[PDB]
């Protein structure tokens with residue numbers, strides 16, 4: 032007897048928490064962690080919606096979501112490796128020399 | 132039903148008693164017995180001589196590429212996990228789908244092996260010079 | 263069922279809030295593990311058993327890779343903790359705090375007006391998910407294989423040494 | 425009085441306003457990634473609030 | 479439902495591009511051959527382009543709940559295939575100067591083209607999400623292909639982080655829409671409604687955040703000059719043409735099919751976004767000394783014009799053919815402009831030639847490239863005798879028919895601002911400044927053919943009108 036609004040609100044709370052972590056953190060690793068929180072919250076919202084309607088499509092969208100999350104984390108870790116190799120620091124404010 | 136809720140209670144009690152037994156053994160180990168005092172007791176063990184630096188360092192692993200590939204391949208594995216529990220219902224059409232999926236998986240694996248993405252052994256440890 | 267849902271959701275919220283406002287990277291990864299375990303418990307409380315199992319299964323491996331990278335780069339003792347703590351200030355977080363709060367307020371206001379009959383929590387099996395996945399969603403499976411292939415190729419090209 | 429062509433300057437006013445507005449808008453492109461994420465969040469808040477009020 | 483052999487025939491460009499992805503990757507695994515792998519990639523893309531004829535002979539029908547193949551999907555598949563073929567042609571002389579491995583470029587281009595084809599055929603929220611990521615992630619690789627440079631690594635990191643954020647936004651919006659509607663199909667988004675349900679509107683708003691990031695629409699536009707400048711020039715060609723075209727096509731299909739496309743609040747929000755996009759993109763390009771950043775702000779403005787054409791989709795009946803004609807003209811003009819940039823940056827030697835001082839006086843050493851670039855500057859300005867004017871005329875006609883007077887005035891004002899900076903570039907080509915391979919000549923032939931097509935279809939647009947009007951979806 033869990034309300035659908037309660038699951039959606041929990042997913043929204045996790046989403047805005049991940050977005051806040053993405054904004055307020057200068058370290059690229061913490062930004063990738065916040066991105067993982069964001070995509071996992073969206074996947075949780077899809078799971079909640081699929082469970083409300085009694086459909087497998089919620090978990091199917093969840094599977095596609097975490098496939099994207101895995102490949103995105105892979106690419107982000109490769110880019111973080113390049114940033115660390117070519118800057119010796121993970122400060123995301125340092126990579127800002129294109130502007131205007 | 133009743134067997135289902137009995138098994139739910141059994142699972143709960145199983146987990147609770149297991150964690151409580153671990154905590155109880157940790158507490159009993161902590162409080163029983165004496166304690167040793169030495170000048171160099173709280174120095175990390177490095178075969179009897181002082182360290183150069185410490186264990187807090189940028190230790191570069193060589194298998195990090197394989198770690199990225201492992202994350203990708205674990206997601207492919209879950210796609211196959213979903214397929215394998217419903218093979219009879221999906222029929223031969225689902226078999227053709229999974230065969231294409233597995234072939235793309237294996238082609239990616241072959242590509243990774245052939246380009247040396249899965250090789251991180253140093254050249255002196257590749258064991259080329261044999262009798 | 264609702265007991266598990268509310269407690270696991272509360273644990274997930276608290277652990278995620280601990281993650282985004284933490285200084286030690288290994289501790290942050292442990293709180294991320296706890297939050298993802300809690301979200302998997304939320305999935306199990308809603309009858310999405312396959313999603314909860316996959317949530318624990320593939321993030322245990324993924325955060326292991328994050329630990330590998332944290333040991334490779336970040337962990338240095340108190341140097342990275344001092345550098346990260348100096349990067350966090352009251353102004354730096356209070357700026358986006360109201361932005362996230364008003365985004366949450368608008369999203370929650372939109373949520374509260376929807377028609378809700380309740381989630382009965384009837385389990386949707388892994389067999390049904392597999393039937394749908396290789397039934398109506400065949401092209402999703404094959405193009406997801408292509409997506410993971412693209413991730414492989416990008417990771418190989420970028421994350422190399424020489 | 426008129427040797428400066430005042431009507432020509434009056435019709436050159438919109439070009440000056442265009443330069444000013446463009447230089448002001450280029451300040452938002454500072455190159456910082458966290459500001460770009462913050463601007464995406466700001467736009468999300470604005471879009472959602474506009475959809476809620478209408 | 480299952481996959482019929484007829485459905486397989488309608489799946490032909492997707493199947494051919496996936497097969498050539500596998501073939502090119504296995505050839506890379508066998509032996510790194512830049513010429514052979516580039517040839518196999520362009521052969522696969524050409525095979526998909528000519529299999530479009532068999533797809534047309536099949537007819538218009540549904541392939542699974544996820545895909546629907548009609549003439550609209552044919553047109554946008556052809557557009558993204560032309561963009562990918564031109565990108566590969568520009569990429570070869572650029573990659574000839576690349577010291578690291580060059581064969582992965584074509585693999586990533588092929589996977590991105592596959593994502594573009596999926597977005598052309600997308601009829602589902604799952605299909606739209608998957609097509610967006612299938613376009614985006616190979617572009618994470620391609621934008622940072624020259625990761626040994628500052629700018630390419632910066633653009634890769636920016637594009638990757640911001641596109642992951644936009645994907646999270648789009649997925650959460652999709653989940654809210656699904657929670658409201660109970661169906662992920664496009665036609666059922668608002669069937670159970672009184673159409674202004676708050677959760678449906680919020681879900682479509684978060685999807686608008688993600689999709690407007692992908693289309694460089696204000697205020698989700700700030701990445702565009704940075705990523706356009708940082709990326710390699712053939713990557714900038716692909717990112718400006720194929721990604722924008724495919725994502726705008728699936729946005730058109732979604733707003734045509736979903737019953738919430740007729741809601742007034744969504745239309746007003748899109749009108750605000752289109753107005754701000756046109757004005758802001760034209761204003762920010764006024765003082766740009768870099769050709770890539772200027773073209774990025776230009777892309778923001780042109781997607782604003784397309785958004786104006788999309789706002790009037792429910793009102794009139796000319797909006798979809800207006801979008802088709804506009805996208806054909808914009809594809810050809812962007813191909814010419816970014817291809818001249820690529821050919822001036824070929825072979826790769828580190829930092830590309832993107833300053834306007836480099837193109838100042840281009841006519842005295844590269845007269846044909848100067849003529850192509852000035853034709854493209856005239857076309858992007860919407861000047862008559864160019865196809866860009868025909869697109870602008872379609873946008874203005876569609877806006878006038880729907881009484882969108884604010885957007886019509888925005889198009890006029892933005893066109894004047896565009897006139898300024900485009901004519902500045904075009905006349906800087908002819909001032910006074912202080913290769914030798916068949917693949918470079920193929921790139922030159924591509925930009926010359928684009929220039930001739932822009933001129934001829936600006937003077938005589940009726941064949942393009944007939945082609946776009948033939949490419950009609952299922953109502």
Ligand SMILES: CCCCCCCCCCCCCCCCCC(=O)OC[C@H](COP(=O)(O)OCCN)OC(=O)CCCCCCCCCCCCCCCCC
Nearest residue numbers: 524527528530531534535537549552553556557806948949
């Ligand atoms: C070196 C090697 C070179 C290889 C060649 C490369 C260059 C040439 C590429 C050739 C591509 C051919 C594509 C052919 C598409 C149309 C095929 C066809 O027969 O369409 C007819 C069909 C309607 O007719 P019918 O078949 O009777 O349908 C009745 C019910 N189905 O029509 C339809 O249903 C709609 C058809 C139109 C869809 C758009 C056209 C395809 C995409 C074009 C993109 C570019 C357009 C802009 C440029 C125009 C220049 C004039």
Ligand SMILES: CCCCCCCCCCCCCCCCCCCC
Nearest residue numbers: 124357358360361456458459462466
């Ligand atoms: C060195 C560069 C650092 C960039 C940090 C960017 C942080 C941006 C924080 C934005 C906070 C906005 C708070 C709400 C403002 C009012 C609502 C939006 C405008 C109408």
